[PDB]
Design a protein around this ligand. Structure first.
Ligand SMILES: NC[C@@H]1O[C@H](O[C@H]2[C@@H](O)[C@H](O[C@@H]3[C@@H](O)[C@H](N)C[C@H](N)[C@H]3O[C@H]3O[C@H](CO)[C@@H](O)[C@H](O)[C@H]3N)O[C@@H]2CO)[C@H](N)[C@@H](O)[C@@H]1O
Ligand SMILES: NC[C@@H]1O[C@H](O[C@H]2[C@@H](O)[C@H](O[C@@H]3[C@@H](O)[C@H](N)C[C@H](N)[C@H]3O[C@H]3O[C@H](CO)[C@@H](O)[C@H](O)[C@H]3N)O[C@@H]2CO)[C@H](N)[C@@H](O)[C@@H]1O
Ligand SMILES: [Mg+2]
Ligand SMILES: [Mg+2]
Ligand SMILES: [Mg+2]
Ligand SMILES: [Mg+2]
Ligand SMILES: [Mg+2]
Ligand SMILES: [Mg+2]
Ligand SMILES: [Mg+2]
Ligand SMILES: [Mg+2]
Ligand SMILES: [Mg+2]
Ligand SMILES: [Mg+2]
Ligand SMILES: [Mg+2]
Ligand SMILES: [Mg+2]
Ligand SMILES: [Mg+2]
Ligand SMILES: [Mg+2]
Ligand SMILES: [Mg+2]
Ligand SMILES: [Mg+2]
Ligand SMILES: [Mg+2]
Ligand SMILES: [Mg+2]
Ligand SMILES: [Mg+2]
Ligand SMILES: [Mg+2]
Ligand SMILES: [Mg+2]
Ligand SMILES: [Mg+2]
Ligand SMILES: [Mg+2]
Ligand SMILES: [Mg+2]
Ligand SMILES: [Mg+2]
Ligand SMILES: [Mg+2]
Ligand SMILES: [Mg+2]
Ligand SMILES: [Mg+2]
Ligand SMILES: [Mg+2]
Ligand SMILES: [Mg+2]
Ligand SMILES: [Mg+2]
Ligand SMILES: [Mg+2]
Ligand SMILES: [Mg+2]
Ligand SMILES: [Mg+2]
Ligand SMILES: [Mg+2]
Ligand SMILES: [Mg+2]
Ligand SMILES: [Mg+2]
Ligand SMILES: [Mg+2]
Ligand SMILES: [Mg+2]
Ligand SMILES: [Mg+2]
Ligand SMILES: [Mg+2]
Ligand SMILES: [Mg+2]
Ligand SMILES: [Mg+2]
Ligand SMILES: [Mg+2]
Ligand SMILES: [Mg+2]
Ligand SMILES: [Mg+2]
Ligand SMILES: [Mg+2]
Ligand SMILES: [Mg+2]
Ligand SMILES: [Zn+2]
Ligand SMILES: [Zn+2]
Lengths: 91, 128, 216, 100, 97, 198, 25
RNA sequence: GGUGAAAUUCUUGGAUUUAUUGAAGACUAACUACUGCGAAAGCAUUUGCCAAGGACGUUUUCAUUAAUCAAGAACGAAAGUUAGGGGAUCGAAGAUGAUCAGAUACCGUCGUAGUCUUAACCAUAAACUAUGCCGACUAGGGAUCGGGUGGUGUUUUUUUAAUGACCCACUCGGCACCUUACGAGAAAUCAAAGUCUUUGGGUUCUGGGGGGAGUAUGGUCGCAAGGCUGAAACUUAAAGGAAUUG
């Protein structure tokens, strides 16, 4: 029961739109649909809806996220520089 | 002792020589003259006689501003660059004795990275 | 045609009193007239003189010290301790092949609330009857050595302020505790304090600034 | 050379008795049968302080785990995850005196 | 056919040495290769040392030195004759001149 | 709706009366329901907090930042945007900051901004993929879509609208001093064509 | 001609030969 | 600024040079060696964590469980590919300035992709020691890395006794090196490239004149660039290796 080979989730799109576009969608499509780790309750309950917001299906806490994934990579590289330049000012 | 003091920072490129005198904290400069002034070449901007003809015209204002004695600071281009002093740099330091300015406390400021950025010229080299 | 130097007001430079010779030389500044006076770019300046010139004993010849101007008082400017370099020639002259070069530092804040990270440099030597051509140290030596190099580098900068270490490094008190400590591991020629870098500073207060100046 | 924690916990795991989780730990706290409690780093400060106050009452040593409840549950060698651990007997391990 | 048993210069049991840039060509070359002659100079040289020690303060003073280690690629090092060509058995000798 | 940058609703207690006062903030990516937002010059440096700009060290990144004090925010409101403080001033309460467009602008150190970079992530990476996906995009925004090409209209409808082939026929770069009704195409255009400028 | 450049030369030949054969659908 | 000389370009909106403070990205100097580690590719700032590996020590344990391998699999420099992050430097394409009979270049200024990272591909390098793995056997010599054993050897303190470092002798296990040819080879050379017409310890892979040609075709893998597999017709007396003298 292997079903598709390449497309997977984007088999829904059939022959339409072109490979690269269809292919680029699958990436983010899988990101946004994935379940993530609650930094609070500690389960993989974090799901999306309404891009930018992410909640826990059990502990009911909602985190402002990236659009299609929970951590903007550039935004974690922010939290660092924020934490860094804070620890310089308070030390 | 007396000897009103200044800091004479000499930078010798293979293509030119910098002779620069300031006060102790490096802010206010006294006079700076280089080989590209005292000759018409583009070849001789680094000339040993150039950099010697430089310290000369410095010294007239050095005693005139009131810097009687001067430290000495020498560097090549450094960083990713040649690191080896130019031709006129040593014919400058000496020509500072033709002034009457009193030298002291020599030291070398050539910038020497901790293993820096990639070098110019591209691998297979500079080929001629 | 113009000449900036007409109008140039000359100033006298006062070192800290944790040193010996306090007369550095005559710095100059542009005049104090209206629109941006001459206490503006005087105050913040940073000077570097040789420790042989400060203490008068030339035994210190290879140690440069950064001296930060803090206050300007009555045509007489006052400074404090900023940083300490090793110059170049000496530092490179201590680097010889066929031996281990050790480096260390640690960040430590002092009691006067100066956050500091101060560097140490060591080496290793043949001892006496050694026929072994090179001096190299085992890595599991260089580890705990550099550790206690910093553990000693901590407790000295930590317990006291900057005014004490300004006079602690002059005799090289710290270096001797490193040869006293690391005697038991490897021979270790040429222990020093190569650089101290002044990161965080308090502000003004002129009670540690005048615990310095006015006496010399 | 150093036992970290989880070695000490692995010995606690099969030597003497223990219980796992908020409810059961409160029992042990209310019975004074608890020598130590370990609290996972991600447990909510409400439970953290409710456990801290419960514990200081009966005077039980308190330790804050460095990991979340996910790694702590595997630190007791259990397959599920646990937010707080109560040590009913040290058995053949220490943890009670040493370095904590 | 093999000219040398160091082949250009010594590796002998490693896979790589992070190559170094030439101080003349900028030509790249492995650190295990690449002729390196440490060069220390007097800060003054010439007859400068005389009237310089004259012109200075401090008693008698002392003279600093510039410290540079230059790395050379073959093509440059041979042209600039840091190193020359030797004979079949002359090349063999590794003793420094 | 029609905003791709989630909103965070922050309650506050009214200083001068006993009531609750709700605020609408743009969530900063890592702001989360239940967290405590701190607001003022004495406030700490943490994601979600709003601070004066001179009150942060340079290098600090911030969003929803006011162009002048107390206008309640302008710059970097969009999903995924931030502005970095590049320096401060002793004189006249000035910071200086680099805006997302890249141009640096010098504003008042008393002006505010919230610590972080707005949520909503990489939203524009995902291809629209369909006409309908762009249809609902603008159904909730404004009706600019779809767009009929001026070169496709008749001369009455657009300067481009000259026909018999499809071509613009005169320079597609219009002046700045041009008049309303002549301005279509590349408007102030400094230069034109493919750049590749990193 | 250089070994390497004979390689690049036929690597271009095989591309053009694939392309002409492609017109046979 | 820049070269052999120049020009390009930067500049009295103060250029290069000077100082104070700040930002981003790379890199990890000197130490650095015919020294280390890893299956290779490779790996070079400090501390912590997570697991790993050799050699050694051993009067533990198991007791043939092993050796080498078609298939199949893990990893695999660099460039390169798809996406975001990044973008300091260097820098294909390119743009130029010079150079030459020409100069699509070498040299000079700028500079796109690249270079950096994350996720995913790609699976090629003179990926070289151009030298399969296991086991035995045959020769002297000093340096050295790690471990162990013996030194009533040595040096620094306050038992000048104690953990160290140094010296010396022995012994495994390493990265190399030197001399000799015992042998071997076409030679260059080689402690293996010896123990080969006195031709067999075990085992894996490849080659069979030069071309044509790594071409054509089929298959297969890849997003693609490409990789893997891989002919024949026909053509030709040389091609080639090492060494010698010119
Ligand atoms: N898909 C995510 C990213 O989108 C951007 O790519 C898009 C833009 O960069 C580019 O320009 C589009 C313009 O065509 C379109 N008609 C309007 C859009 N605002 C523009 O974007 C442009 O302007 C915005 C501000 O408006 C700038 O912030 C941005 O830097 C600039 N590229 O058009 C691209 C799409 O056709 C990133 N540049 C690209 O690297 C990446 O694909
Ligand atoms: N696998 C190493 C073997 O060492 C053997 O023995 C060597 C050494 O083990 C032995 O010891 C020598 C000593 O003789 C000589 N007079 C002084 C030398 N330092 C010693 O070497 C010793 O110290 C050095 C460091 O100094 C260490 O690197 C080495 O491991 C150690 N054995 O001396 C030999 C060298 O002259 C044989 N040379 C040979 O079988 C092989 O090389
Ligand atoms: Mg934080
Ligand atoms: Mg020149
Ligand atoms: Mg000129
Ligand atoms: Mg001129
Ligand atoms: Mg040549
Ligand atoms: Mg131990
Ligand atoms: Mg053990
Ligand atoms: Mg709770
Ligand atoms: Mg090599
Ligand atoms: Mg290699
Ligand atoms: Mg419509
Ligand atoms: Mg359109
Ligand atoms: Mg249209
Ligand atoms: Mg029409
Ligand atoms: Mg019209
Ligand atoms: Mg028209
Ligand atoms: Mg028409
Ligand atoms: Mg028509
Ligand atoms: Mg058309
Ligand atoms: Mg058209
Ligand atoms: Mg018109
Ligand atoms: Mg080949
Ligand atoms: Mg067909
Ligand atoms: Mg000309
Ligand atoms: Mg200037
Ligand atoms: Mg280093
Ligand atoms: Mg196989
Ligand atoms: Mg690669
Ligand atoms: Mg690449
Ligand atoms: Mg492409
Ligand atoms: Mg960017
Ligand atoms: Mg460049
Ligand atoms: Mg070109
Ligand atoms: Mg002609
Ligand atoms: Mg001709
Ligand atoms: Mg032409
Ligand atoms: Mg012509
Ligand atoms: Mg070029
Ligand atoms: Mg592109
Ligand atoms: Mg191959
Ligand atoms: Mg090789
Ligand atoms: Mg091969
Ligand atoms: Mg040993
Ligand atoms: Mg026979
Ligand atoms: Mg054949
Ligand atoms: Mg092929
Ligand atoms: Mg094929
Ligand atoms: Mg031949
Ligand atoms: Zn949760
Ligand atoms: Zn070169």
């Amino acid at each position: 029961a292997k079903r598709t080979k390449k497309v997977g989730i984007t088999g829904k799109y059939g022959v339409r739109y072109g490979s690269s576009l269809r292919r680029q969608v699958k990436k983010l499509e899988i990101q946004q649909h994935a379940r993530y780790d609650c930094s609070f309750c500690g389960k993989k309950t974090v799901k999306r809806g309404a891009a930018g917001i992410w909640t826990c299906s059990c502990c009911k806490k909602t985190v402002a996220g990236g659009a299609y994934t929970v951590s903007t990579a550039a935004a974690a590289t922010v939290r660092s520089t924020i934490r860094r330049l804070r620890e310089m000012v308070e030390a | 002792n007396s000897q009103v003091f200044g800091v004479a920072r000499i930078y010798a490129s293979f293509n030119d020589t910098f002779v620069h005198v300031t006060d102790l904290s490096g802010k206010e400069t006294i006079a700076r003259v280089t080989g590209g002034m005292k000759v018409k070449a583009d070849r001789d901007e680094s000339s040993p006689y150039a950099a010697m003809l430089a310290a000369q015209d410095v010294a007239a204002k050095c005693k005139e501003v009131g810097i009687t004695a001067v430290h000495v600071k020498i560097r090549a281009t450094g960083g990713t660059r040649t690191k080896t002093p130019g031709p006129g740099g040593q014919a400058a330091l000496r020509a500072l004795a033709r002034s009457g300015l009193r030298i002291g406390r020599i030291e070398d400021v050539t910038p020497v990275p901790s293993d820096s950025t990639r070098k110019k010229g591209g691998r297979r080299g500079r080929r001629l | 045609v113009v000449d900036p130097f007409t109008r140039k007001e000359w100033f006298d430079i006062k070192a800290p009193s944790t040193f010996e010779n306090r007369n550095v030389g005559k710095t100059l500044v542009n005049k104090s007239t209206g629109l941006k006076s001459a206490s503006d770019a005087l105050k913040g300046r940073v000077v570097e003189v040789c420790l042989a010139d400060l203490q008068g004993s030339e035994d210190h010849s290879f140690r440069k010290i950064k001296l930060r101007v803090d206050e300007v008082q009555g045509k007489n400017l006052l400074t404090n301790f900023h940083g300490m370099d090793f110059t170049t020639d000496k530092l490179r002259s201590m680097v010889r092949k066929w031996q281990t070069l050790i480096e260390a530092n640690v960040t430590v804040k002092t009691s006067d609330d100066y956050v500091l990270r101060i560097f140490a440099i060591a080496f290793t030597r043949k001892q006496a009857n050694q026929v072994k051509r090179h001096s190299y140290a085992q890595s599991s030596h260089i580890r705990a050595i550099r550790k206690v190099i910093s553990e000693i580098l901590t407790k000295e900068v930590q317990g006291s302020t900057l005014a004490q270490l300004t006079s602690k490094l002059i005799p090289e008190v710290i270096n001797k505790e490193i040869e006293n400590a690391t005697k038991d591991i490897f021979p270790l020629q040429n222990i020093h304090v190569r650089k101290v870098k002044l990161l965080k500073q308090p502000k003004f207060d002129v009670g540690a600034l005048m615990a310095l100046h006015g006496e010399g | 050379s150093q036992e970290s924690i989880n070695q000490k916990l692995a010995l606690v795991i099969k030597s003497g008795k223990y219980t796992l989780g908020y409810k059961s730990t409160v029992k042990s706290l209310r019975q004074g049968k608890s020598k130590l409690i370990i609290i996972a780093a991600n447990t909510p400060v409400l439970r953290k302080s409710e456990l801290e106050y419960y514990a200081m009452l009966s005077k039980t040593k308190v330790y804050y785990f460095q990991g979340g409840n996910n790694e702590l549950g595997t630190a007791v060698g259990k397959l599920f995850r646990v937010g707080v651990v109560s040590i009913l007997e040290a058995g053949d391990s220490d943890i009670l005196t040493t370095l904590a | 056919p093999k000219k040398r048993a160091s082949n250009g210069r010594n590796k002998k049991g490693r896979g790589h040495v992070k190559p170094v840039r030439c101080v003349n060509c900028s030509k790249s070359i492995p650190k295990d290769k690449a002729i390196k002659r440490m060069a220390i100079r007097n800060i003054v040289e010439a007859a400068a040392v005389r009237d310089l020690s004259e012109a200075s303060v401090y008693p008698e003073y002392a003279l600093p030195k510039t410290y540079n280690k230059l790395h050379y690629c073959v093509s440059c090092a041979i042209h600039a004759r840091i190193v020359r060509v030797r004979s079949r058995e002359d090349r063999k000798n590794r003793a420094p001149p | 709706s029609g905003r791709g940058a989630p909103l965070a609703k922050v309650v506050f207690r009214d200083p001068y009366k006993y009531r609750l006062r709700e605020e609408i903030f743009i969530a900063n990516e890592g702001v989360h329901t239940g967290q405590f937002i701190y607001a003022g010059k004495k406030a700490s440096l943490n994601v979600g907090n709003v601070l004066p700009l001179g009150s942060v060290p340079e290098g600090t990144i911030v969003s929803n930042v006011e162009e002048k004090p107390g206008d309640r925010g302008a710059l970097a409101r969009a999903s995924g945007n931030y502005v970095i403080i590049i320096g401060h001033n002793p004189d006249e309460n000035k910071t200086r900051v680099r805006l997302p467009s890249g141009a640096k602008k010098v504003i008042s150190s008393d002006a505010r901004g919230v610590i972080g970079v707005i949520a909503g992530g990489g939203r524009v990476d995902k291809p629209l993929l369909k006409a309908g996906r762009a249809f609902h995009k603008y159904r909730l925004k404004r009706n600019s879509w779809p767009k009929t090409r001026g070169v496709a209209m008749n001369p009455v409808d657009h300067p481009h609208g000259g026909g018999n082939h499809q071509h613009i026929g005169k320079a597609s770069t219009i002046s700045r001093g041009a008049v309303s009704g002549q301005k279509a195409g590349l408007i102030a255009a400094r230069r034109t064509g493919l750049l590749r400028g990193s | 001609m250089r070994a390497k450049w004979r390689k690049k030369r036929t690597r271009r030949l095989k591309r053009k030969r694939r392309k002409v054969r492609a017109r046979s659908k």
